[PDB]
Design a protein around this ligand. Structure first.
Ligand SMILES: O=C(O)[C@@](O)(COP(=O)(O)O)[C@H](O)[C@H](O)COP(=O)(O)O
Ligand SMILES: O=C(O)[C@@](O)(COP(=O)(O)O)[C@H](O)[C@H](O)COP(=O)(O)O
Ligand SMILES: [Mg+2]
Ligand SMILES: [Mg+2]
Lengths: 447, 444, 91
C-alpha cells in the first residue's frame, strides 16, 4: 500500500539518457526516426526505446517490483535525425534471432507518435554473439568441398521460373552445368507444384548433376529448394536431398521464418549439407529509405543464425542496390571485424567473435557486360548468378554458360595481372571474345 | 526461338482476360519509375512473380507458357489487378504464396514503390488449408462466456518481472475480472524470467484465481522461441500443465514454424493466439509494403484462433474503415467486396471457422464505447497498461475495465445509442463503481 | 458434405445406404463429377505416365506385360524361373 505516482508520463522523462555510456555487452540500435508534427525528436526516440523494452504508455504499479534501470533501454544519442538506443544484454534470449526481432522491431514501427521509422543498423555484442552457431561451413570450407580456388564461383537460375516438368528441368540443368557453370539453383517460386513436384525434381536434377560431373571432371552442385509450408516438411525434403548425394539445399529464410530457418540449419549441419539462403521478400523491408529495416541488419542476423550463402544484390542489375551500401554488406559478411564507416552506412564496429564468413551471392539482371563491374565490387569470394543471362543466349543454355564462364575467367585473370578493371572491362571482354565465339554473341545481343 | 530483351507488357498484359474462379487475383498499387508506363510496370510485376525474366529464354518453348503465366487483366489508373493460375501454388502452404507474389517483385528498379492492397484466394485453393483449430463458436463454449467481448490484459512492465512477481500480477488481474492475461510478445525465456519457471508459476495463479472467482480464466503463454523444435517443446509443457492457451508471434517466428506449431497446438487441445509483431514494418506506409488484410487472410488460412487487429483509437495507427473490413475477413463466412472498407475482391471462406479479432493498444475505459461499437461482442479487448495503471493496482484496474465493458454492452442491448451516449453510460456506471470512477478521472 | 482428401467418405455417403432401400429395386451410379475444389485435396498418382516411361527408358510403343501362371501352386524357385523366361524373352 504505497500509491505510486500514477498517470501518463512523457517517455523523455525516464527513457532518454544523453549521459549514458554503452557497455561492451549492450545491444546498440540506430533508428532513423520521422516523428509527428509537434512531437519532439527527443520524445519519439524515448518512445521507441521504451516500447522495445520495459516501457508502457502509463506508469504501472508493477514498475516497483523490479530494478528498472537494470533492464530498460535508453536513447543515449540523437545525431540530428538518427537516434542510438542501447539495450541491456539481459533483455534477450540466448541464441534466438526471433526474440531480438520481437523486441527491436516487434512493436515500435506502428506507433502514432512516429510517422516513419527505419532500423538502420545494430551492434550485436560479443557476449550475445557467442551464443550463436554461425554458418555451418563458411567460405574456406566450401571452397575445399567444391575444389575451386581463386575466382568468383559461377551459378545460374533455371528459367522460366515455373512451368518446366522434371524431365525438362533436368535437361536445362545439365545444359548449364555442362557448359561451365559450377552451380545452378531452383528458383524461389519452385517449391513443389503440380507441374514440377519436389520428389520428381530432386531425382531428375541430381541425375543431371551426377552426369555433368562425369564429363566436365569438376564438381557441380544444384541448390535444391527445400522450402515448404511447415518445418517438418522442410526437414523431410532435407534428408531426401541429403540421401541423393546432394551437396546443397536452399531455403527462403525470410519467408519461411527465422525459427524454421534455424531448425533447417541444424539439420543441414547434421547431414553435411551446405545451406544457400535466398532472401526472397526482403524488399518489403529494405526498399524505402524512410521505413523498414535495412538489409545490413538482416545480413547480420543471417550470419549469427548461420547461412553459407546469401543474396546481397548486384548494383547494376535489374533489382535495386546501392554501390556503397552493398560493399558494406560484403565486408559485414566476409570479414571478422568491421570498423564503422559513415560512407558505407556502418554505424557501429562489429566484431564477429570467430564466426565463419558467408559467400555474398550477386544475382539479378546481370549478363557478361556486368562481369567487370561485379568483380570490382565483390572480388573473388562471391557467387555470380546468371539465370536469364545464360538461357537468354541466342544459341542455347550450354553456349550461354560458356560465355559467362569465359567472361569471368578473362576479367579475373586480367585483374590478377595488375591491369585496371573498371576502365577497360570493355576491352578485356573484346579481346576475350576475339577467341571465344560464344562471348561475341553474348555481347552482340546485350548492351 | 528468338532471343533478346522484349517489353513485359506484350506477354503479361492481357486486358481482355477474364479471371476464373480458380485464380489468385492480387491488387497491386504501383508507383513506376518516372518514364516507365503504368501498364509496363504492371506487367513486370506479373511476369517476375510467376514465370518471367528480363530476357526471352530458349526454355520457354519447352512449356505451354500461356497455361502458367500470370497476367495483368485490369488497371484502375493506379491499382493493377494480376491473375495467378491455380497450378502455380503448392497445396496448403502460405509460404509459397508469399514467396511468389511478394517474394521478388518489390525490389525492382522500374517500380519506385509497390503495395499489395488485397488478394483473392479461390475456394479450390482454400480447401487445402486446415483453418483455425477451434474458432469463435467453439472457444466461447470452452470458456463458457457469451454475449460480451472477452476481456484480456498484457502483463506490464514488458520485461523485468521475475517469475514469482510476474505470477502475482497475473493473479491480481484474473481475480479482478479479466477473463485472460497474456505473456508479452518479447517475453520468451529471458534470464530474469525463464519459461519453465514462468509457466509453472502463472498456471498456479490461473488455477488459484479460477478456483476463487468460479469462472474460467486463462493465460496466453508465449511459446515463441528460436526454433520449431523448441516451440514444440514449450507448447507441450503448457499443455501438460493444464493451460488452455499458448501464444506465438506468427510473423517474427515466420509462417512455416507457425504452421508447424499450429499442427501440434491442435493435437494438444490448445487454443492458439497469434501475435502480429513486426506487422507495422509491412502495413504502415500507404505506398509500399503488404496490407494487413492480406496477412489477416493468411492467418485464417493457416489457422489462428486469435489475431491482433489493432484498435482504431489506441496508441497504434489503424484505420476505422480498414479495421472494419479486416474484422469481417476474420469472422464472417463470405465478405462481399467493398471499396469504402478497403476490400477489392469477394472472399468465400469455404467453411473455414472464424477468428477472434483482438483489439489491443493504448486503450482505457474511455475507449470502451468506441471499441464495442466497432468490434461488437465477438472480440477480445486487451487492457495491458489500462489495468496496471489504475491508481489502486491491477485487481482494482481489472474491475474498472470489466465494469465499463458490461455497462456499455448492457446499455447497447437496451437499445441506447453507444457512440453518442458512451460518456453518460460510463458516468452512470461510475456512480456506483468506485474503481471505474478512479480510472475515468485519471485518464482523459 | 465431404471430408477433404478421403475417398472412403465419398463412397460412404453416396453409395453407402441408398442402394438397399425397398423403394428402389435397382440403382446404378453411372458417373460422378468431382469438383476441382475437392480435387486439390488429393495427391494423385505418385509417378504418372511420363515419369514412369522415363524411369524405364521406353518410348513410342505400348509396354508389354504378363502374369505368371499357374496363379497358385508354383514354388518360389520354380516361380522365379518362369519370371526369368518371360522377362528375358521380350516382356
Ligand atoms: O528471381 C530472379 O530474378 C532470380 O532468380 C534471378 O534470375 P535472373 O538472374 O534470370 O534475373 C533471383 O532469385 C533474383 O534476382 C533475386 O534477386 P536478389 O538476389 O537481389 O534477391
Ligand atoms: O506491447 C504493447 O503495447 C501491448 O502489450 C499492449 O500493451 P498496452 O495495452 O499497455 O498498450 C501489445 O502487445 C501491443 O500493443 C500490440 O499491439 P498490436 O495489437 O497492434 O500488435
Ligand atoms: Mg529467383
Ligand atoms: Mg505487447
Amino acid at each position: 500500500r504505497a500509491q505510486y505516482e500514477a498517470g501518463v508520463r512523457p517517455y523523455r522523462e525516464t527513457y532518454y539518457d544523453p549521459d549514458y555510456e554503452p557497455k561492451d555487452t549492450d545491444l546498440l540500435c540506430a533508428f532513423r526516426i520521422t516523428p509527428k508534427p509537434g512531437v519532439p525528436m527527443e520524445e519519439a526516440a524515448a518512445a521507441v526505446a521504451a516500447e522495445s523494452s520495459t516501457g508502457t504508455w502509463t506508469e504501472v504499479w508493477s514498475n516497483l517490483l523490479t530494478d528498472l534501470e537494470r533492464y530498460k533501454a535508453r536513447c543515449y544519442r540523437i545525431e540530428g535525425d538518427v537516434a542510438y538506443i542501447a539495450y541491456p544484454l539481459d533483455l534477450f534470449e540466448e541464441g534466438s534471432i526471433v526474440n531480438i526481432m520481437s523486441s527491436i522491431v516487434g512493436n515500435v514501427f506502428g506507433f502514432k507518435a512516429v510517422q516513419a521509422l527505419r532500423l538502420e543498423d545494430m551492434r550485436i555484442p560479443v557476449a550475445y554473439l557467442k551464443t550463436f552457431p554461425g554458418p555451418p561451413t563458411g567460405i574456406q570450407v566450401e571452397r575445399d568441398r567444391l575444389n575451386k580456388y581463386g575466382r568468383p564461383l559461377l551459378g545460374g537460375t533455371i528459367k522460366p521460373k515455373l512451368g518446366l516438368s522434371a524431365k525438362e528441368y533436368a535437361r536445362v540443368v545439365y545444359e548449364c552445368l555442362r557448359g561451365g557453370l559450377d552451380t545452378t539453383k531452383d528458383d524461389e517460386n519452385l517449391n513443389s507444384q503440380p507441374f514440377n513436384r519436389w520428389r520428381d525434381r530432386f531425382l531428375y536434377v541430381m541425375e543431371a548433376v551426377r552426369k555433368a560431373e562425369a564429363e566436365t571432371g569438376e564438381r557441380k552442385g544444384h541448390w535444391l529448394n527445400v522450402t515448404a509450408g511447415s518445418t517438418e516438411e522442410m526437414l523431410k525434403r532435407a534428408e531426401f536431398a541429403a540421401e541423393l548425394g546432394s551437396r546443397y539445399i536452399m531455403v527462403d529464410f525470410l519467408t519461411a521464418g527465422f525459427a524454421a530457418f534455424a531448425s533447417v540449419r541444424r539439420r543441414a549441419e547434421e547431414l553435411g549439407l551446405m545451406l544457400h539462403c535466398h532472401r526472397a521478400m526482403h524488399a518489403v523491408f529494405d526498399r524505402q529509405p524512410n521505413h523498414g529495416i535495412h538489409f545490413r541488419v538482416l545480413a547480420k542476423w543471417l550470419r549469427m543464425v548461420g547461412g553459407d550463402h546469401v543474396h546481397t544484390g548486384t548494383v547494376v542489375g535489374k533489382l535495386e542496390g546501392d554501390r556503397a551500401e552493398t560493399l558494406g554488406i560484403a565486408d559485414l559478411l566476409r570479414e571478422d571485424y568491421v570498423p564503422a564507416d559513415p560512407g558505407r552506412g556502418l554505424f557501429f564496429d562489429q566484431d564477429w567473435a570467430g564466426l565463419k564468413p558467408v559467400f555474398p551471392v550477386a544475382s539479378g539482371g546481370i549478363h557478361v557486360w556486368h562481369v567487370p563491374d561485379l568483380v570490382s565490387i565483390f572480388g573473388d569470394d562471391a557467387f555470380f548468378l546468371f539465370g536469364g543471362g545464360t538461357h537468354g543466349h541466342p544459341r542455347g543454355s550450354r553456349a550461354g554458360a560458356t560465355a559467362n564462364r569465359v567472361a569471368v575467367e578473362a576479367v579475373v585473370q586480367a585483374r590478377n595481372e595488375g591491369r585496371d578493371i573498371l576502365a577497360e572491362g570493355r576491352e578485356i571482354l573484346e579481346e576475350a571474345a576475339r577467341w571465344c565465339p560464344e562471348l561475341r554473341e553474348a555481347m552482340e545481343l546485350w548492351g
